[PDB]
Design an enzyme around this catalytic site. Structure first.
Site, PDB file in Angstrom:
ATOM      1  N   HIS A 240      91.538  -5.569 -16.437  1.00  0.00           N
ATOM      2  CA  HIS A 240      90.758  -5.367 -15.172  1.00  0.00           C
ATOM      3  C   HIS A 240      89.514  -4.712 -15.175  1.00  0.00           C
ATOM      4  O   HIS A 240      88.564  -4.707 -14.632  1.00  0.00           O
ATOM      5  CB  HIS A 240      91.700  -4.994 -14.085  1.00  0.00           C
ATOM      6  CG  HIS A 240      90.979  -4.851 -12.769  1.00  0.00           C
ATOM      7  ND1 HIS A 240      90.988  -6.316 -12.104  1.00  0.00           N
ATOM      8  CD2 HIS A 240      90.399  -3.998 -12.020  1.00  0.00           C
ATOM      9  CE1 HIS A 240      90.152  -5.900 -10.862  1.00  0.00           C
ATOM     10  NE2 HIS A 240      90.015  -4.762 -10.751  1.00  0.00           N
ATOM     11  N   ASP A 244      85.941  -5.668 -14.025  1.00  0.00           N
ATOM     12  CA  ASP A 244      84.913  -4.757 -13.076  1.00  0.00           C
ATOM     13  C   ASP A 244      83.820  -4.237 -13.835  1.00  0.00           C
ATOM     14  O   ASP A 244      82.579  -4.351 -13.326  1.00  0.00           O
ATOM     15  CB  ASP A 244      85.647  -3.507 -13.059  1.00  0.00           C
ATOM     16  CG  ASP A 244      86.896  -3.497 -12.099  1.00  0.00           C
ATOM     17  OD1 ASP A 244      87.117  -4.641 -11.239  1.00  0.00           O
ATOM     18  OD2 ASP A 244      87.346  -2.365 -11.565  1.00  0.00           O
ATOM     19  N   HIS A 267      82.654   2.334 -11.843  1.00  0.00           N
ATOM     20  CA  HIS A 267      81.471   1.745 -11.013  1.00  0.00           C
ATOM     21  C   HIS A 267      80.265   2.494 -10.892  1.00  0.00           C
ATOM     22  O   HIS A 267      79.276   2.007 -11.172  1.00  0.00           O
ATOM     23  CB  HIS A 267      81.889   1.398  -9.722  1.00  0.00           C
ATOM     24  CG  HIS A 267      83.300   0.461  -9.547  1.00  0.00           C
ATOM     25  ND1 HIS A 267      83.218  -0.773  -9.959  1.00  0.00           N
ATOM     26  CD2 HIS A 267      84.455   0.741  -8.828  1.00  0.00           C
ATOM     27  CE1 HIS A 267      84.384  -1.289  -9.973  1.00  0.00           C
ATOM     28  NE2 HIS A 267      85.022  -0.625  -9.321  1.00  0.00           N
TER      29      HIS A 267
HETATM   30  N1  LIG Z   1      90.058   2.099 -10.322  1.00  0.00           N
HETATM   31  C1  LIG Z   1      89.580   0.632 -10.254  1.00  0.00           C
HETATM   32  C2  LIG Z   1      89.643   0.194  -8.773  1.00  0.00           C
HETATM   33  N2  LIG Z   1      90.750   0.118  -7.969  1.00  0.00           N
HETATM   34  C3  LIG Z   1      90.704   0.065  -6.821  1.00  0.00           C
HETATM   35  O1  LIG Z   1      89.607   0.014  -6.112  1.00  0.00           O
HETATM   36  C4  LIG Z   1      92.095   0.388  -5.962  1.00  0.00           C
HETATM   37  C5  LIG Z   1      92.329   1.108  -4.804  1.00  0.00           C
HETATM   38  C6  LIG Z   1      93.275   1.173  -4.167  1.00  0.00           C
HETATM   39  C7  LIG Z   1      94.430  -0.145  -4.538  1.00  0.00           C
HETATM   40  C8  LIG Z   1      95.696   0.013  -3.745  1.00  0.00           C
HETATM   41  C9  LIG Z   1      96.582  -0.364  -3.221  1.00  0.00           C
HETATM   42  C10 LIG Z   1      97.752  -0.536  -2.402  1.00  0.00           C
HETATM   43  C11 LIG Z   1      98.803  -0.678  -1.728  1.00  0.00           C
HETATM   44  C12 LIG Z   1      99.780  -0.442  -0.744  1.00  0.00           C
HETATM   45  C13 LIG Z   1      99.881   0.422   0.257  1.00  0.00           C
HETATM   46  C14 LIG Z   1     101.018   0.072   1.196  1.00  0.00           C
HETATM   47  C15 LIG Z   1     102.035  -0.631   0.991  1.00  0.00           C
HETATM   48  C16 LIG Z   1     101.692  -1.814  -0.046  1.00  0.00           C
HETATM   49  C17 LIG Z   1     100.907  -1.418  -1.062  1.00  0.00           C
HETATM   50  C18 LIG Z   1      94.323  -0.680  -5.447  1.00  0.00           C
HETATM   51  C19 LIG Z   1      93.064  -0.782  -6.475  1.00  0.00           C
HETATM   52  C20 LIG Z   1      88.873  -1.428  -8.930  1.00  0.00           C
HETATM   53  O2  LIG Z   1      89.451  -2.398  -9.443  1.00  0.00           O
HETATM   54  N3  LIG Z   1      87.764  -1.509  -8.094  1.00  0.00           N
HETATM   55  O3  LIG Z   1      87.202  -2.805  -8.264  1.00  0.00           O
HETATM   56 ZN   LIG Z   2      88.284  -3.998  -9.681  1.00  0.00          ZN
END
Ligand SMILES: NC[C@H](NC(=O)c1ccc(C#CC#Cc2ccccc2)cc1)C(=O)NO
Ligand SMILES: [Zn+2]
Length: 302
Positions: A240, A244, A267
């Site tokens: 992933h 990204d 990012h």
């Molecule tokens: N570090 C990599 C970044 N990740 C995120 O931005 C990211 C932020 C928050 C979450 C989340 C979540 C969740 C949830 C949840 C909350 C309550 C109940 C069930 C699920 C996943 C990825 C990404 O992939 N950006 O493109």
């Molecule tokens: Zn991502």
């Protein structure tokens, strides 16, 4: 010439519905064909007048949790997963219409986007596809984080992660993907976004990850993955980060001929690498190929 690597656009207009990962707002995504030398251009059709933000490195605003495109006070959040799909399938020109400030998260991967683009079909345009070939090594670093551009005859992405968590430590930390031998669709596109539940609780209160769920993100505790159906790949977390990176690097405006090396990068450091590269004009050149067979990068049939 007819045998040249031609620019690509969509054959038809395709629509998709979803929610923003960080905003939680319902959003209508519309992918449209675009003329020669347009590039990827994002459009906020919910605003009167319609605001257009080209998917370029200079228009990058915030890089906290996702890559954000800014023009004045108008924003386009989480562009990296859709741009990854555009780069992977070699889409040069496209109009991306959105009814909200954030791109739909879908399943947290580039999978549905790659399917939505390929279902609409691809169209070859009467113009040479421009490539940015890496001539010299260009690197950016900040503490224990590094992002490097290394000269390579083709396109290769390497990523190394280091998370102090048993679930992450128990899985693959490093992966090298050479797109001359490996498929973006089969091995990268399906890698979903990941997040720590204890970290997501602090984000949801601070008006972030509002549209987050187990259906669009890999929710993790300390020892295991909270998702019932597990993982799509054994190395899904590092895959992933590669996904990204491909999406972030496509903000150059053209496809890359070289190797990307990411060491705990994100990012912010990806955008800082593009800005340092563009600024160091001796380290890169714009190249076109009159014969597709002689080029070190090949693409899927339109
Ligand atoms: N570090 C990599 C970044 N990740 C995120 O931005 C990211 C932020 C928050 C979450 C989340 C979540 C969740 C949830 C949840 C909350 C309550 C109940 C069930 C699920 C996943 C990825 C990404 O992939 N950006 O493109
Ligand atoms: Zn991502």
């Amino acid at each position: 010439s007819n045998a040249m690597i031609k620019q690509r656009t969509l054959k038809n207009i395709i629509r998709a519905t979803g929610v923003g990962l960080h905003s939680g707002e319902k959003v209508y995504l519309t992918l449209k064909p675009a003329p020669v030398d347009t590039g990827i251009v994002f459009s906020r059709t919910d605003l009167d007048p319609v605001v257009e933000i080209p998917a370029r490195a200079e228009n990058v605003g915030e890089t906290t949790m996702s890559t954000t495109l800014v023009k004045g006070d108008v924003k386009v959040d989480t562009v990296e997963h859709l741009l990854s799909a555009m780069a992977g399938l070699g889409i040069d020109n496209a109009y991306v219409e959105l009814s909200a400030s954030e791109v739909p998260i879908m399943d947290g991967s580039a999978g549905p986007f790659v399917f939505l683009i390929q279902s609409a079909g691809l169209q070859e345009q009467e113009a040479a596809k421009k490539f940015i070939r890496i001539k010299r090594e260009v690197s950016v670093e900040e503490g224990d984080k590094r992002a490097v551009f290394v000269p390579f005859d083709g396109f290769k992405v390497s990523f190394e992660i280091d998370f102090d968590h048993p679930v992450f430590r128990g899985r693959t930390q490093q992966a090298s993907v050479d797109f001359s031998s490996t498929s973006f669709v089969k091995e990268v596109s399906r890698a979903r976004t990941f997040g720590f539940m204890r970290d997501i609780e602090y984000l949801r209160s601070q008006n972030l990850a509002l549209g987050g769920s187990v259906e669009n993100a890999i929710v993790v505790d300390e020892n295991r993955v909270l998702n019932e159906d597990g993982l799509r790949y054994e190395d899904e977390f590092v895959k992933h980060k590669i996904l990204d990176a491909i999406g972030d690097l496509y903000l150059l405006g053209n496809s890359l001929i070289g190797e990307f090396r990411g060491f705990k990068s994100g990012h912010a450091l990806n955008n800082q690498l593009l800005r340092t590269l563009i600024a160091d004009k001796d380290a890169w050149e714009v190249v076109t190929f009159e014969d597709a067979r002689t080029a070190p990068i090949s693409y899927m049939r339109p």
